[PDB]
Symmetry: C2
Protein backbone atom coordinates (compact mmCIF):
# COMPACT_ATOMS: atom_id res chain seq x y z
CA UNK A 1 0.00 0.00 0.00
CA UNK A 2 2.00 3.02 -1.25
CA UNK A 3 1.46 6.51 0.11
CA UNK A 4 0.00 7.55 -3.25
CA UNK A 5 -2.53 4.73 -3.41
CA UNK A 6 -3.41 5.53 0.20
CA UNK A 7 -3.91 9.13 -0.92
CA UNK A 8 -5.97 7.92 -3.88
CA UNK A 9 -8.20 5.90 -1.56
CA UNK A 10 -8.52 8.26 1.41
CA UNK A 11 -8.60 11.58 -0.47
CA UNK A 12 -9.60 10.99 -4.08
CA UNK A 13 -12.06 8.10 -3.71
CA UNK A 14 -13.46 9.55 -0.51
CA UNK A 15 -14.19 12.80 -2.31
CA UNK A 16 -15.58 11.33 -5.53
CA UNK A 17 -17.60 8.44 -4.14
CA UNK A 18 -19.82 10.54 -1.84
CA UNK A 19 -20.44 13.20 -4.48
CA UNK A 20 -23.95 14.16 -5.60
CA UNK A 21 -22.93 13.40 -9.21
CA UNK A 22 -21.24 10.07 -8.44
CA UNK A 23 -24.22 7.75 -8.55
CA UNK A 24 -24.09 6.88 -12.31
CA UNK A 25 -20.42 5.87 -11.90
CA UNK A 26 -20.71 3.81 -8.70
CA UNK A 27 -21.27 0.59 -10.67
CA UNK A 28 -20.47 -0.60 -14.21
CA UNK A 29 -22.70 0.65 -16.98
CA UNK A 30 -25.57 -1.79 -17.41
CA UNK A 31 -26.17 -1.55 -21.14
CA UNK A 32 -29.33 -3.65 -20.98
CA UNK A 33 -30.89 -1.76 -18.07
CA UNK A 34 -29.87 1.66 -19.50
CA UNK A 35 -30.96 0.63 -23.00
CA UNK A 36 -27.60 1.33 -24.66
CA UNK A 37 -27.20 -1.65 -27.04
CA UNK A 38 -24.11 -0.22 -28.77
CA UNK A 39 -22.30 0.58 -25.52
CA UNK A 40 -19.94 -2.39 -25.45
CA UNK A 41 -19.36 -2.02 -29.18
CA UNK A 42 -17.97 1.49 -28.66
CA UNK A 43 -16.47 1.25 -25.15
CA UNK A 44 -14.09 -1.72 -25.03
CA UNK A 45 -12.67 -1.07 -21.52
CA UNK A 46 -15.60 -0.25 -19.24
CA UNK A 47 -14.68 1.25 -15.90
CA UNK A 48 -16.52 2.63 -12.88
CA UNK A 49 -15.90 3.78 -9.34
CA UNK A 50 -17.17 0.63 -7.64
CA UNK A 51 -14.52 -1.43 -9.43
CA UNK A 52 -11.86 1.12 -8.49
CA UNK A 53 -13.12 1.37 -4.89
CA UNK A 54 -12.94 -2.41 -4.56
CA UNK A 55 -9.49 -2.57 -6.18
CA UNK A 56 -8.20 0.12 -3.82
CA UNK A 57 -9.76 -1.94 -1.03
CA UNK A 58 -8.15 -5.25 -2.10
CA UNK A 59 -4.74 -3.66 -2.89
CA UNK A 60 -5.15 -4.70 -6.52
CA UNK A 61 -2.92 -1.87 -7.78
CA UNK A 62 0.87 -1.92 -7.81
CA UNK A 63 1.17 1.80 -8.65
CA UNK A 64 -0.86 4.98 -8.41
CA UNK A 65 -0.48 5.49 -12.16
CA UNK A 66 -2.59 2.35 -12.50
CA UNK A 67 -5.40 3.64 -10.31
CA UNK A 68 -5.16 7.03 -11.99
CA UNK A 69 -5.51 5.37 -15.40
CA UNK A 70 -8.70 3.63 -14.33
CA UNK A 71 -10.24 6.93 -13.21
CA UNK A 72 -9.21 8.44 -16.53
CA UNK A 73 -10.65 5.52 -18.52
CA UNK A 74 -13.96 5.88 -16.70
CA UNK A 75 -14.22 9.59 -17.52
CA UNK A 76 -12.93 9.12 -21.09
CA UNK A 77 -15.47 6.34 -21.83
CA UNK A 78 -18.19 8.79 -20.90
CA UNK A 79 -16.90 11.61 -23.12
CA UNK A 80 -16.42 9.22 -26.03
CA UNK A 81 -19.69 7.30 -25.81
CA UNK A 82 -22.14 10.04 -24.93
CA UNK A 83 -23.50 12.93 -26.99
CA UNK A 84 -21.79 16.24 -26.11
CA UNK A 85 -25.08 17.60 -24.66
CA UNK A 86 -25.81 14.66 -22.33
CA UNK A 87 -26.03 15.68 -18.70
CA UNK A 88 -23.70 12.77 -17.83
CA UNK A 89 -20.83 14.38 -19.73
CA UNK A 90 -20.99 17.42 -17.52
CA UNK A 91 -21.42 15.17 -14.48
CA UNK A 92 -18.19 13.37 -15.45
CA UNK A 93 -16.50 16.69 -16.20
CA UNK A 94 -17.38 17.93 -12.71
CA UNK A 95 -16.06 14.78 -11.03
CA UNK A 96 -12.93 14.72 -13.18
CA UNK A 97 -11.98 18.26 -12.15
CA UNK A 98 -12.17 17.20 -8.50
CA UNK A 99 -10.02 14.18 -9.35
CA UNK A 100 -7.42 16.36 -11.10
CA UNK A 101 -7.43 18.92 -8.28
CA UNK A 102 -6.84 16.20 -5.70
CA UNK A 103 -4.18 14.56 -7.83
CA UNK A 104 -2.27 17.86 -7.91
CA UNK A 105 -1.40 17.31 -4.20
CA UNK A 106 -0.65 13.56 -4.26
CA UNK A 107 2.69 12.54 -2.68
CA UNK A 108 5.96 11.69 -4.49
CA UNK B 1 6.13 27.55 -8.43
CA UNK B 2 8.10 24.30 -8.32
CA UNK B 3 5.06 22.40 -9.64
CA UNK B 4 4.48 24.73 -12.56
CA UNK B 5 8.16 24.41 -13.55
CA UNK B 6 7.64 20.63 -13.48
CA UNK B 7 4.60 20.99 -15.74
CA UNK B 8 6.61 23.25 -18.04
CA UNK B 9 9.90 21.41 -18.21
CA UNK B 10 9.11 17.71 -17.52
CA UNK B 11 5.47 17.02 -18.43
CA UNK B 12 4.90 19.47 -21.28
CA UNK B 13 8.26 18.72 -22.90
CA UNK B 14 7.54 14.98 -22.91
CA UNK B 15 4.10 15.60 -24.42
CA UNK B 16 5.23 18.30 -26.86
CA UNK B 17 7.83 16.12 -28.63
CA UNK B 18 5.62 13.04 -28.84
CA UNK B 19 4.84 11.74 -32.29
CA UNK B 20 1.09 12.06 -31.61
CA UNK B 21 1.35 15.61 -30.22
CA UNK B 22 1.28 17.49 -33.51
CA UNK B 23 -2.52 18.10 -33.59
CA UNK B 24 -2.34 19.54 -30.07
CA UNK B 25 0.59 21.97 -30.39
CA UNK B 26 -1.66 24.84 -31.54
CA UNK B 27 -5.36 25.75 -31.35
CA UNK B 28 -7.85 24.00 -33.58
CA UNK B 29 -8.38 26.18 -36.66
CA UNK B 30 -11.94 25.19 -37.50
CA UNK B 31 -11.76 26.93 -40.88
CA UNK B 32 -8.47 25.56 -42.23
CA UNK B 33 -9.29 22.08 -40.92
CA UNK B 34 -12.85 22.04 -42.26
CA UNK B 35 -14.96 21.72 -39.09
CA UNK B 36 -17.52 24.59 -38.92
CA UNK B 37 -19.44 22.80 -36.11
CA UNK B 38 -16.31 22.74 -33.95
CA UNK B 39 -16.98 25.87 -31.91
CA UNK B 40 -20.65 25.05 -31.47
CA UNK B 41 -19.68 21.84 -29.68
CA UNK B 42 -16.39 22.88 -28.08
CA UNK B 43 -16.97 26.08 -26.11
CA UNK B 44 -13.58 26.01 -24.30
CA UNK B 45 -10.87 25.34 -26.90
CA UNK B 46 -7.48 24.37 -25.48
CA UNK B 47 -4.14 23.18 -26.88
CA UNK B 48 -0.59 22.67 -25.70
CA UNK B 49 0.59 25.88 -27.40
CA UNK B 50 -1.73 28.00 -25.27
CA UNK B 51 -0.68 26.10 -22.15
CA UNK B 52 2.98 26.61 -23.11
CA UNK B 53 2.64 30.42 -23.55
CA UNK B 54 0.66 30.55 -20.31
CA UNK B 55 3.44 28.77 -18.43
CA UNK B 56 6.03 31.11 -19.99
CA UNK B 57 4.20 34.35 -19.11
CA UNK B 58 3.31 33.18 -15.58
CA UNK B 59 -0.43 33.08 -16.26
CA UNK B 60 -1.14 30.20 -13.89
CA UNK B 61 -1.43 30.61 -10.17
CA UNK B 62 -1.28 26.90 -9.31
CA UNK B 63 -0.37 23.56 -10.90
CA UNK B 64 -4.01 22.41 -10.86
CA UNK B 65 -5.03 25.35 -13.06
CA UNK B 66 -2.62 24.06 -15.68
CA UNK B 67 -3.57 20.40 -15.20
CA UNK B 68 -7.18 21.53 -15.78
CA UNK B 69 -6.16 23.09 -19.08
CA UNK B 70 -4.48 19.84 -20.17
CA UNK B 71 -7.67 17.98 -19.29
CA UNK B 72 -9.92 20.41 -21.13
CA UNK B 73 -7.83 19.89 -24.27
CA UNK B 74 -8.10 16.10 -24.02
CA UNK B 75 -11.78 16.19 -23.06
CA UNK B 76 -12.50 18.44 -26.03
CA UNK B 77 -10.97 15.85 -28.32
CA UNK B 78 -13.06 13.00 -26.90
CA UNK B 79 -16.25 15.05 -26.97
CA UNK B 80 -15.99 16.52 -30.48
CA UNK B 81 -14.60 13.54 -32.45
CA UNK B 82 -16.22 10.21 -33.35
CA UNK B 83 -14.99 7.24 -31.26
CA UNK B 84 -13.36 5.66 -34.33
CA UNK B 85 -11.17 8.70 -35.11
CA UNK B 86 -7.41 8.20 -34.83
CA UNK B 87 -7.14 11.49 -32.97
CA UNK B 88 -9.10 9.90 -30.11
CA UNK B 89 -6.37 7.24 -29.73
CA UNK B 90 -3.69 9.91 -30.06
CA UNK B 91 -5.22 11.99 -27.27
CA UNK B 92 -5.56 9.01 -24.90
CA UNK B 93 -1.96 7.98 -25.55
CA UNK B 94 -0.87 11.53 -24.76
CA UNK B 95 -3.27 11.71 -21.81
CA UNK B 96 -1.82 8.59 -20.15
CA UNK B 97 1.72 10.04 -20.40
CA UNK B 98 0.43 13.24 -18.76
CA UNK B 99 -1.23 11.26 -15.95
CA UNK B 100 1.98 9.24 -15.49
CA UNK B 101 4.18 12.35 -15.41
CA UNK B 102 1.78 14.16 -13.06
CA UNK B 103 1.92 11.31 -10.52
CA UNK B 104 5.60 12.23 -9.99
CA UNK B 105 5.01 15.96 -9.46
CA UNK B 106 6.65 17.48 -6.35
CA UNK B 107 3.98 17.40 -3.63
C1 LIG C 1 -28.98 6.94 -6.69
N1 LIG C 1 -29.63 7.93 -7.57
C2 LIG C 1 -29.62 9.27 -7.15
O1 LIG C 1 -29.02 9.60 -6.13
C3 LIG C 1 -30.36 10.13 -8.02
N2 LIG C 1 -30.63 11.47 -7.97
C4 LIG C 1 -31.40 11.75 -9.05
N3 LIG C 1 -31.64 10.68 -9.81
C5 LIG C 1 -30.98 9.68 -9.16
N4 LIG C 1 -30.93 8.35 -9.53
C6 LIG C 1 -31.54 7.87 -10.78
C7 LIG C 1 -30.24 7.44 -8.73
O2 LIG C 1 -30.15 6.26 -9.05
C1 LIG D 1 -21.44 6.22 -17.44
N1 LIG D 1 -22.79 6.26 -18.02
C2 LIG D 1 -22.90 6.58 -19.38
O1 LIG D 1 -21.88 6.67 -20.09
C3 LIG D 1 -24.24 6.78 -19.78
N2 LIG D 1 -24.79 7.16 -20.98
C4 LIG D 1 -26.13 7.23 -20.79
N3 LIG D 1 -26.48 6.92 -19.54
C5 LIG D 1 -25.30 6.65 -18.93
N4 LIG D 1 -25.13 6.31 -17.61
C6 LIG D 1 -26.24 6.33 -16.67
C7 LIG D 1 -23.86 6.07 -17.13
O2 LIG D 1 -23.68 5.66 -16.00
C1 LIG E 1 -7.56 18.75 -31.71
N1 LIG E 1 -8.04 18.36 -33.04
C2 LIG E 1 -9.31 17.76 -33.12
O1 LIG E 1 -9.99 17.64 -32.12
C3 LIG E 1 -9.62 17.33 -34.44
N2 LIG E 1 -10.73 16.71 -34.96
C4 LIG E 1 -10.47 16.50 -36.26
N3 LIG E 1 -9.28 16.94 -36.64
C5 LIG E 1 -8.76 17.47 -35.49
N4 LIG E 1 -7.53 18.08 -35.34
C6 LIG E 1 -6.61 18.23 -36.47
C7 LIG E 1 -7.15 18.56 -34.09
O2 LIG E 1 -6.11 19.16 -33.94
Amino acid sequence: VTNQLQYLHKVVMKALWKHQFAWPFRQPVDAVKLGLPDYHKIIKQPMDMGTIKRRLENNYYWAASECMQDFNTMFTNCYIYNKPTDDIVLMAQTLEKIFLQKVASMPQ
